[PDB]
Design a protein around this nucleic acid. Structure first.
Lengths: 107, 302, 712, 196, 106, 209, 193, 113
RNA sequence: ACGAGAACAUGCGCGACAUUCCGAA
């Protein structure tokens, strides 16, 4: 899995890698994932707000910016939006969960 | 004459009854096979002259993947240990290659027990069934036991049939029909189906070509009153009581038993060879019930 | 009544040994003791008792016609100083070539204990007083009283040593010595009467070389009488009434054998002393080697063949084979004793080969008319069949049933229930009925059962004990509230019993008296002690003797009593005798012939190899007696039963896991033991048993036993 | 002259089949190979019962399955052999590690105490198949077709009925597949003969 | 035991803030007051129960009383209050009503 | 003329179905078809529940302790075993197998055909909760049910099918196996076709629901 | 022998949590569900507390006779059938569509400081409704009125108390709205009750 | 019997503790996922099966991070490495063997409790 | 002219009764 390699490359982990700073991104991913789990244009709006919030967290914290840069998470959100299928969004959420799980595992 | 080995490989368990349905023998005598052949020849509308005049057959003998078995000769064993004679007594069948060794008394009691336990025929069992014919008429089920014998995959039965070309061909046709007619006591109820192979046996041809001072009965047989004068002198034999019911659709309105017969068991040793007879065991019936008591002789040196 | 005098003198020739041990020579003491009684004051008896040894016989001053010489020579043949010495066990010398010589002795049914013991002079005094009281009034002299005298001698002197010589072993009892001496004296008397000898002294005793010549002269006949068809007669029966007739058929066959023996002895004017052995259809006897005796044997053989053909056709038969035997052969000085017995057996087998003659074979196939109706238990149609489809026999065998339980005596009389040779009939009757039968007609024979003629036979039947379950019979055993309802069938046999007779006793010890003692000990164990062994168990003893043992009862009771019987047989023989049995478990209404055949093949499986094994239920259950008693039951079955007390489904899961030897099944069994909610140490024990081969089989057997015990 | 017609095929165990070490309510098994079997007696009896119910013994039932009545001795035309656990099903069950038999667990709720009484029965697994082999004896040509119709009828009934040990409670449902119907003895034309 | 129901009204005289775990920086629009799923601000009953437990600090009697979550509060009441920390607080004069059910008779 | 009528249809699991089967730390698993390892509804459970509900509806004999002491209609439908009064069971209810349509609907959405329901027992004296896991068939499942009615008497067929309709109604309003008094075993019957497979009986006007 | 079918709705007044921490969800629809076991257990416990309890009541088989009558019994030799068959309360489709009208999730997450170690509990959003389905078996005509009186008392007590989760902290309040009480099977008259 | 050895070598007593306090509750989710994959394989490797195995490895890592006992169990028994081996070989027999190995591991873990 | 011929180990049976994912912040 690509998540493990990038996570262990970030391992020295960063503050963005830590669950503390990553908490807000996890909560937003949880919101969109719960919407799809219950299930869309609203999903597209949530993904756009997710990219905006990625920029938000990058501005508020350099470590989260480094995490986003290394994991290509915003680019993967763009790829999911281009594909626009539930399956690819579920795969992206699984990739994000794998990132978080590997970060917890190495810490 | 022409001698043919007929080997029977059984697909389903076979039921061979000595006196009861629960009894499960592993072989049949010559008279049972001859009765089956006569019934088959009557079903196929064939002449019975060849069977009644020229056909000479032996009892059904075990065989396995290793060797063919023959009945134990009734000879005197010279043998300090009386239990060795018991071990010889429990022995029933001997491989063909060991027959001459046994006749010369070269098989010891431990060797005899090894031969007896080397038999790889199959397993006998008792299948318990019910009769619900009474349940409909305010009755109850009637359990009953059928004894059956399941042969091992490479085991089976065999017999040697002796006769001229016409008798051999008619026997081949009859055995082809018997493959699906079946042998045993539950043929119509699922027991006794088999496939037969008839071929020349060089091994048994060499075995029968042997001469000697003693004669061994390969088939259940009995001499006529004329031949019994000289054959019975200095003989070791075993009298087996052949009893049964008549199996036909025309003998009588109700099923009746045959007249009891007594025959010399296979393996009995006689110093004078006697030719047997097809004894008529019918008693005031529409037809005549036959019982094959002809003698198949194996010569040997004791 | 010179023959009767010789019989009485030979049986009582050593009656003075008991008085001497109670505390002159024992012969003189016995002469005085017998002279104390007027009926036994007859010349022949007292002369035989007083002068049966060389020192007294040299200066006896007799008429040379006295039976004292015959008594002395018979005593020499039969027998050929710690006053307080015990009776040595006969098995001390048997199989001593391999398993050594033991020191087991009998204390004054008794088991040898292998301990130091002595016979107190007070005990011998009490025995002397008992003999005096019995001889004074209860016993008399006469042709009909010798059987009672023999029974009294057997009852009293069975555990008194024949001789107290310390150098020799004390295997032979006083009763055995007296009986063998009496039989030999009777045979010698018949031989001398046939040879018209008037001076017995000049014939054998006077030169002291003619005694050795007479030892070298052929005087006796070893006779074997074998009955064939017993097993098929008893067990090859069909019907719902066959279980009740199982014991009746065996009892009828045993009584028929006893009747044959008694008829043969009566024709020879001999007593039961000449009857060496009587077992499962076999009867070994010692007869005179006279032309009259051989003619009697031929006539009896022909008559018995004719009767068995008339009644049973080829079903049951009997053969008689005799071999001429010498005094040296009886004493085994040359070594031909075992050869003599083997020759008798081989001649018997040769007669059993050519069993029927030309005319009998021709008459067998006459069969004028068809069978038509046939009886139920007997698949015979030649015999006239009554209503309800019962043959003439098995209608009367059923009458002997329900009367064997009620009555104790067996009457052979002109009128009865089951046919017997010489146009007689066997009927089971009580004391008053037997007395009435004797009063109405002579030639009527009364047989008492383990008490007239006394017969030792194991007749243990738990059904007859309870009046409520008496009518049900063997099936009553399956009536149970807990445990699977099944019948256990035990088919047991001693390994190399005939071989033990032939070679178990060494050549330095083999003799006629030793064989008689060994046979009597085996008969007493398998006819008398077996009933005490099986006490309190739901078991019906169908056949006994050790040569062929058949019991039927409850399966668990059969297994437990088989273990107890193995232990008791180890005690009785003091080792040196293995015991192999096959156990089978069958439902009720299962064919009795099928049960017998399956238990027989299990017995054959147990016989092969170690010859000391048990086939418990199938071909995979061949175990050792100690292994079954300790490992399967005590070490495994008991802990599982204690832990589970039902857990039947848990045991079924364990069985289905153990039937598969795959390692995944091993892990599943470990998980099941973890989830079993029983003691952890027992879980480890069970897992270790499963892992180890030859212990997994024991665990499976214990689980199956517990399942069968917890069934409803 | 005389003819014998062979019918080979498969019996598929649609629902668990129960025909009566230590096992509670075991199925009938081959003594040697320990494989489950369908006895030819069970097949013959079930077919005879269904034919008797359909027609109604009748002359057809005695003609097919045999009769020993006084004055009416008729040889059985139908010889139905024991059905053996097929080798293909044996291999399929060897794959995927599946036992040839299952233990069905049941209970009885009493009408008085409502307590359940546990019970276990062995059954043949639903994936199983059995080779069945039947012989028809052509004793009378003119009736052959009629007999086969009856046979067909019986088989149809048998495919709506059960085979043994249960049925009204879901056991024993089976299906017949007729591989071939060939005349092994004689010259009777059995090509048009058919079942189902 | 006898159950008693009390309608308990808490009057806001000073700003009260209940942490919802959510903080918004200037770009989004600051600690956010807790709101239910529907989005209405309310005072959780767990916070009040913990405050009363701390005030008391018996155990059995305190677990007998159940204090439910408060009724939804009007959106106008929420405001931003400085402490360099800004939090969402309920405005003064707001009454928050809840129900308390006591099973302890004594 | 032997007439055999076949009823084929679906059984839908309204709430989690738990039919116990011997054979994971759950307290009790469900019965499964060994060949496919899919959950099953044994015909024994269906017949037993239908017979019990019919017996309750008609009315049990006071002091009844046998299943052969039920009403004559029950013994006519479900069979009897009395000595001398053995009645053949006209109803033959088969095992209901997890349908292929439901198996595909569960392969879609990535479901496991089963659920582990967590429950607990709270002691009435100490208030301590002992947990317990049970296995249930998911409420999306459907089972193919196949029932055979035997026409042993033409006259009683309509009455028997009325009884079967009553039994089906009772079973639908009751549950099927397991702890159905705690939201288990709720089922619905959807009959596809009632046809006379054997014979000449006209079952067009026959319905069990 | 009649069956009375009582349907209705269970409205979540305050956040509802029934653990399986995540709340229990129906696997097929991936939606919150109130199991029938939870409702039956809570109602039985509340009704038993309403009636007197023996001092050493350590088992559910030794409650008041009304409790064993309504909710069944497993007492050895005294097995009483449960006249009540509580069913799983599934998420109402009307409430589901109401939540789907807006951008609202069916479940909320609530944080407690636990002073401080933060703890997060998932609850069912306030305002959600679950439709229940109770079956009452009429196995005794004379006892139906008393059993329904006990049912009403238990329902009132449950509306007073909470259902599942930590109710003292303030979550789990529910309300029952009865739709129809009709004898679905049989000829019994349920119009009065 | 590698599973037996690896469960016995880490068996210690403080109350028998396995893998520093491992309980079946900590393994419930892992067992559920493995059962789901096993049922999917038995019904039919496939692409969805491989995705399931990769998610299984991800969940292995997540549970190892969450609980130290699960981490000890996973690193001792090489369960995730065997998942990688199954992915590499890509044959259903190897996955059946892996399932049997995990079943033996949990069975032996409960056996030594 | 097979110890044979005819014979369903068959009939009734719920894996079922009671059980809060719960107390604490």
């Amino acid at each position: 899995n690509f998540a493990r390699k990038v996570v262990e490359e970030n391992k020295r982990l960063f503050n963005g890698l830590t669950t503390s700073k990553l908490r807000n991104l996890l909560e937003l991913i949880n919101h969109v994932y719960t919407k799809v789990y219950n299930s869309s244009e609203d999903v597209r709006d949530e993904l756009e707000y997710l990219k905006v919030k990625f920029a938000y967290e990058s501005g508020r914290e350099p470590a989260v910016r480094t995490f986003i840069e290394k994991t290509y998470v915003d680019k993967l959100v763009d790829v999911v939006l281009k594909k626009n299928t539930k399956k690819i969004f579920l795969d992206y959420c699984k990739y994000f969960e794998a990132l978080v799980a590997y970060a917890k595992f190495y810490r | 004459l022409v001698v043919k080995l007929v080997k029977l490989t059984f697909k389903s368990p076979v039921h061979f009854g000595m006196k009861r349905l629960s009894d499960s023998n592993h072989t049949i005598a010559a008279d049972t096979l001859f009765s089956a052949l006569i019934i088959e020849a009557l079903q196929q509308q064939l002449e019975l002259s060849h069977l009644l005049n020229n056909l000479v057959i032996t009892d059904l003998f075990p065989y396995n993947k290793t060797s063919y078995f023959l009945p134990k000769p009734l000879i005197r064993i010279e043998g300090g240990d009386e239990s060795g004679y018991k071990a010889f007594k429990k022995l029933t069948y001997i491989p063909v290659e060991n027959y001459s060794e046994y006749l010369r008394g070269e098989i010891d009691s431990l060797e005899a027990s090894k031969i007896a336990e080397s038999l790889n025929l199959g397993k006998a069992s008792l299948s318990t069934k019910v009769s619900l014919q009474a349940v409909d008429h305010n009755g109850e089920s009637e359990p009953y036991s059928v004894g059956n014998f399941t042969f091992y995959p490479e085991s089976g039965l065999y017999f040697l049939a002796k006769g001229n070309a016409d008798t051999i061909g008619q026997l081949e046709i009859l055995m082809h029909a018997l493959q699906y007619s079946g042998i045993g006591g539950k043929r119509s109820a699922g027991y006794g189906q088999f496939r037969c192979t008839i071929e020349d046996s060089g091994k048994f041809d060499s075995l029968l070509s042997q001469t000697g001072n003693i004669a061994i009965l390969l088939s259940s047989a009995m001499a006529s009153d004329e031949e019994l004068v000289d054959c019975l002198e200095d003989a070791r034999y075993l009298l087996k009581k052949r009893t049964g019911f008549v199996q036909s659709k025309t003998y009588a309105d109700q099923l009746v038993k045959k007249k009891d017969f007594y025959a010399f068991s296979a393996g009995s040793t006689f110093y004078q060879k006697f030719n047997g007879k097809i004894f008529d065991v019918s008693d005031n019936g529409r037809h005549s019930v036959y019982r094959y008591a002809k003698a198949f002789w194996l010569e040997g040196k004791i | 009544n010179k023959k009767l005098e010789l019989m009485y003198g030979s049986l009582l020739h050593d009656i003075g040994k008991i008085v001497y041990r109670s505390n002159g020579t024992h012969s003189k003491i016995g002469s005085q003791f017998l002279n104390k009684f007027k009926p036994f004051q007859l010349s022949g008896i007292v002369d035989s008792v007083s002068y049966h040894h060389y020192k007294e016989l040299a200066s006896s001053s007799l008429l040379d016609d006295s039976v004292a010489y015959i008594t002395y020579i018979a005593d020499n043949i039969a027998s050929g100083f710690d006053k307080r010495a015990p009776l040595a066990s006969i098995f001390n010398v048997v199989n001593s070539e391999t398993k050594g010589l033991a020191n087991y002795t009998y204390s004054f049914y008794r088991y040898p204990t292998d301990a130091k013991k002595e016979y107190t002079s007070s005990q011998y005094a009490a025995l002397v007083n008992k003999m005096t009281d019995d001889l004074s009034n209860k016993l008399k002299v006469g042709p009909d009283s010798f059987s009672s005298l023999l029974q009294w001698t057997e009852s009293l002197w069975s555990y008194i040593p024949s001789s107290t010589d310390t150098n020799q072993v004390m295997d032979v009892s006083l009763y055995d010595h007296s009986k063998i001496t009496c039989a030999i004296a009777s045979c010698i008397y018949d031989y001398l009467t046939e040879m018209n000898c008037v001076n017995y002294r000049k014939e054998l005793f006077s030169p002291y070389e003619k005694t050795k010549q007479f030892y070298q002269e052929d005087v006796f006949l070893l006779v074997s009488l074998d009955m064939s068809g017993i097993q098929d007669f008893i067990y090859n029966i069909s019907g719902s009434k066959a279980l009740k007739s199982l014991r009746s058929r065996s009892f009828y066959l045993e009584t028929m054998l006893e009747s044959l023996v008694d008829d043969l002895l009566s024709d020879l004017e001999l007593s039961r002393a000449n009857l060496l052995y009587t077992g499962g259809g076999h009867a070994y006897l010692l007869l005179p080697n006279t032309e009259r005796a051989r003619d009697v044997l031929a006539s009896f053989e022909g008559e018995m063949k004719e009767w068995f053909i008339k009644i049973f056709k080829t079903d049951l038969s009997v053969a008689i084979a005799y071999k001429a035997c010498t005094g040296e052969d009886l004493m085994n000085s040359n070594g031909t004793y075992s050869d003599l017995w083997q020759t008798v057996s081989r001649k018997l087998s040769d007669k059993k080969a050519h069993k029927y003659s030309l005319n009998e074979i021709k008459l067998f196939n006459s069969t004028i008319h068809a069978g038509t109706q046939e009886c139920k238990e007997c698949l015979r149609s030649d015999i006239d069949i009554s209503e309800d489809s019962l043959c003439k026999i098995c209608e009367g065998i059923i009458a002997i049933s329900n009367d064997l339980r009620d009555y104790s005596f067996f009457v052979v009389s002109p009128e009865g229930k089951v046919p017997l040779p010489r146009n007689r009939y066997l009927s089971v009757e009580n004391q008053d009925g037997a007395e009435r039968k004797i009063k109405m007609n002579k030639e009527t024979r009364i047989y008492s059962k383990n008490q007239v003629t006394n017969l030792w036979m194991c007749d243990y039947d738990f059904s007859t004990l309870n009046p409520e379950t008496k009518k049900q019979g063997i099936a009553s055993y399956v009536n149970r509230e807990v445990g699977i309802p099944r019948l256990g069938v035990l088919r047991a046999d001693i390994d190399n019993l005939g071989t033990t007779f032939i070679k178990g006793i060494p050549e330095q010890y083999r003799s006629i008296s030793r064989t008689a003692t060994l046979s009597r000990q085996l008969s007493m164990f398998f006819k008398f002690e077996l009933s005490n062994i099986l006490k309190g168990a739901r078991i019906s003893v169908i056949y006994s003797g050790g040569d062929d043992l058949f019991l039927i009862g409850a399966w668990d009771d059969v297994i437990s009593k088989a273990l107890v019987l193995r232990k008791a047989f180890t005690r009785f023989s003091a080792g040196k005798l293995t015991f192999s049995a096959g156990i089978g478990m069958y439902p009720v209404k299962y064919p009795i012939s099928k049960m017998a055949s399956e238990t027989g093949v299990l017995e054959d499986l147990a016989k092969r190899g170690e010859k000391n094994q048990v086939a418990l239920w199938n071909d995979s259950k061949v175990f050792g007696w100690s292994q079954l008693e300790e490992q399967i039951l005590k070490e495994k079955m008991i802990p599982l039963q204690e832990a589970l007390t039902h857990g039947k489904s848990f045991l079924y899961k364990m069985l289905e896991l153990l039937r598969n030897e795959d390692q995944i099944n091993i892990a599943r069994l470990a998980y099941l033991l973890a989830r079993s909610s029983l003691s952890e140490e027992l879980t480890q024990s069970i897992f270790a048993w499963s892992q180890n081969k030859q212990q997994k089989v024991e665990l499976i057997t214990a689980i199956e036993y517990l399942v069968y015990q917890i069934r409803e | 002259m005389y003819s014998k017609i062979r019918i080979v095929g498969k019996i598929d165990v649609l629902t668990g089949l129960h025909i009566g070490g230590a096992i509670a309510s075991p199925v009938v098994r081959d003594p040697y190979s320990r494989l489950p079997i369908i006895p030819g007696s069970s097949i013959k009896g079930k077919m005879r019962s269904l034919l008797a119910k359909h027609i109604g013994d009748a002359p057809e039932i005695l003609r097919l399955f045999g009769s020993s009545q006084k004055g009416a001795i008729q040889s059985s035309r139908l010889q139905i052999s024991d059905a053996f656990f097929s080798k293909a099903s044996q291999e399929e069950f060897d794959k995927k590690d599946l036992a040839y038999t299952e233990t069905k667990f049941e209970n009885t709720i009493s009408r008085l105490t409502a307590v359940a009484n546990p019970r276990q029965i062995e059954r043949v697994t639903r994936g199983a198949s059995f080779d069945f082999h039947i012989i028809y004896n052509v004793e009378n040509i003119n009736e052959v077709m009629a007999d086969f119709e009856n046979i067909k009828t019986a088989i149809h009934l048998l495919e709506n009925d059960y085979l043994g040990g249960g049925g009204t409670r879901g056991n024993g449902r089976i299906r017949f597949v007729i591989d071939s119907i060939d005349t092994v003895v004689g010259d009777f034309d059995s090509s048009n003969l058919s079942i189902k | 035991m006898i159950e008693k129901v009390y309608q308990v009204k808490l009057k806001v005289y000073g700003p009260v803030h209940i942490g919802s775990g959510k903080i918004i920086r200037k770009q989004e629009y600051l600690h956010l007051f807790v709101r239910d799923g529907r989005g209405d601000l309310y005072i959780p009953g767990s916070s009040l129960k913990g405050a009363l437990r701390t005030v008391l600090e018996s155990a059995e009697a305190f677990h007998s009383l159940s204090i439910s979550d408060s009724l939804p509060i009007d959106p106008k009441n929420l405001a931003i209050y400085q402490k360099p920390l800004y939090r969402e607080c309920v405005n003064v004069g707001t009454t928050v009503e809840f129900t308390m059910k006591i099973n302890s008779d004594d």
